[PDB]
Each structure stands twice: as C-alpha cells, then as structure tokens.
C-alpha cells in the first residue's frame, strides 16, 4: 500500500492516480474563496461557479494552461493531495505531475514546491501530450510516428512522438473554454440573452457539434439590456454555427503540425492517423472534421478524459521508468 501518486493537473479537471490502486480522485480544478480564505475546492466549488453570493468567488487557478494565481493554485493542489492520502500506506511519497507543455521553469518550480509542501519526498514532471499518448495506448517508445491531439479546457496540445521523445509539440489556447465562450457570445448576439459558463458547457455537451446538421433544447439566462430572467430555444444548427470558429482553430493547429513532419514519420501518420484525447475529443463530429481536413484516419481514445492520468499512472507503476522521470526533471 503506497502513497505514491500521479496528478493530472488540468486546466479544468484534476485527476489523481495512486500507485497500486488506480484513479482515486477526479474533480474540477476550481477553488471557492470567501472574503480571502479558501471555502471549498473541487466538486463543491464548481457547483458554485456563477452562483456565488456576496463576499465569495470561485476561481480556476490553472484556467488558460498557465498559473493565474500561484497561492490559490498551491492551495488547490495541496487540498487534493491531502484528500487522497492513505494513513495505512508507506511514506516518502513519489509524485508525478502532468503539466502543460508550455509550462515555464517558474510554473514548474511552483508545482514542484506545492507538492513538497503537501508532503511529497520527490516530484517528477511529464508534459501533457506525452502522458496523453501513453494513456491512449500509443506506442510512444517504438521507432514509429504517433500523433496525439489532446483537447482540454484551456488548451489543445498537439504532438508527434517517437522513441520516447518529442518530434513536434505545440499548444494553442483553444479548447473547451473557447467553445463555451463562443456559445455565450452566440446567445448574446442572436438571442439577447446573457448565459453563464455552466449553461454554456451544458449546451456544448447536449447539442454541440463540429458539423452542422436540428435537435433543440431550452436555455435560460439574463436579458442582455434589461436584466430579467428569460428562456430561449437553441438548435444544433445554431450550436454548430456558434462553435465553428474555435473548431476551425483546433483543426488549423492540427494541420500546422502535419506540415512539421519528417518523411518516414509522415509515412507512419498516413498509416494510422491521429489519436484524439481530452474532454474536447468528446465534441460530436470533431473527429470527422479533423479527418476531412487532413485526409487522415482519426480515432477518439477510449476514456479520453482519463488518458493523461492513466498515462502518468503507467509511468508511476514502473520504478525504472519513474526513476528516469524524476532524474530528468
Ligand atoms: N461531451 C462533451 N462534449 C464537448 N466537450 C466536452 C464534453 N465533455 C467534456 N467536455 C469538455 O472537456 C473539457 C475538459 O477536458 P479535460 O481534458 O478534462 O481538460 P483539462 O485536462 O484541461 O482539465 C471541458 O471544456 C469540458 O466542457
Ligand atoms: Mg488535460
């Protein structure tokens, strides 16, 4: 029984895999503050978004793939590490954290320090797309080109991997948050209705699609000019029109990456195509849209919200592998 853990420190969700057990925590990366003092973290805090009374706020400290607020991010990480601690497990926890590939040295050090402050003995860091590819089952250690597109909340990470390293990697700030924001802006312009982020995510999941048709649902929010509650209907067709711009940006980032490939690796990617992971991979039709623009097969990973955590967990379970990650960090 171990306290070694692997943390997918996501812009939107944090997952923790614990050695010998598997995923033991999956909660939103949200912290609620009371006037400032921490009031709630995780599942309870997300439910507060857009619903807070005076003297309270709810914050996503890792929102855009960068640390927005270092103190709040540290309290969030420590809260989750403490939550999974097993008093019957061994001590001196080894911790792997998956961080955005663009994370700077300062952010990496802050993440390291947060884990040490929560009791970690040693911390190793792995970049998002490598962990995503491992957890999606791609053969990243082989001499063959594997391409992964990980659509998260604040970012999409695109990479081509071979022989345990990176051939190409780029992230852009377009993923599920920009999809939500496009839906908010759409409702404002076309229905004079102000909606919040939770309603926007609900539209996205229930009727959002990357491909115009259709079906409709009821949406409620604040009248734009006068402020009063209002209910309106929105269709798949409207949702698809709302989402076209961020979808196109994700598709462009994928296309750009392909221009970046050595011939024999291009040959491998022509063969097997592109693997999608992350929650944004669940956007209906996004696989088809990428396929149309690239000419390549597109597969959605099994359990795409969990791939990064499963991939980190795989590394954590392999002492040789883990020792190497710790060392190169
Ligand atoms: N069914 C769905 N359709 C579209 N987007 C979805 C769906 N389910 C989850 N998402 C989106 O996935 C994003 C979260 O993906 P995730 O990989 O957990 O991000 P991160 O690793 O950055 O925390 C959110 O924007 C969420 O709304
Ligand atoms: Mg992620």
Author numbering: 9 to 43, 48 to 225, 230 to 345
Give me lines lifted from the publication on this model.
Crystal structures of CcMreB in different nucleotide states, either as a monomer or as a polymer, were determined to a resolution better than 2 Å. Most crystal structures were obtained using ΔCcMreBdh, which behaved biochemically better than the full-length protein, yet was still showing correct filament formation as presented in Figure 6—figure supplement. Once MreB is in the polymeric state, the presence or absence of nucleotide has very little effect on the overall structure, which is presumably stabilised by inter- and intra-protofilament contacts. From the ΔCcMreBdh co-crystal structures with ADP and AMPPNP, it is clear that the active site could well accommodate a guanidine instead of an adenine as the major contacts are with the ribose and phosphate moieties of the nucleotide, a feature, again, shared with ParM.
In non-spherical bacteria, the actin homologue MreB is essential for shape maintenance as depletion of MreB through genetic knockouts or MreB-targeted drug treatment results in misshapen cells that eventually lyse. Here, we demonstrate that MreB from Caulobacter crescentus forms pairs of antiparallel protofilaments as revealed by crystal structures, an architecture unprecedented among actin-like proteins. The crystal structure of Caulobacter MreB (ΔCcMreBdh) reveals the typical actin fold, containing two domains on either side of a nucleotide binding cleft (Kabsch and Holmes, 1995).
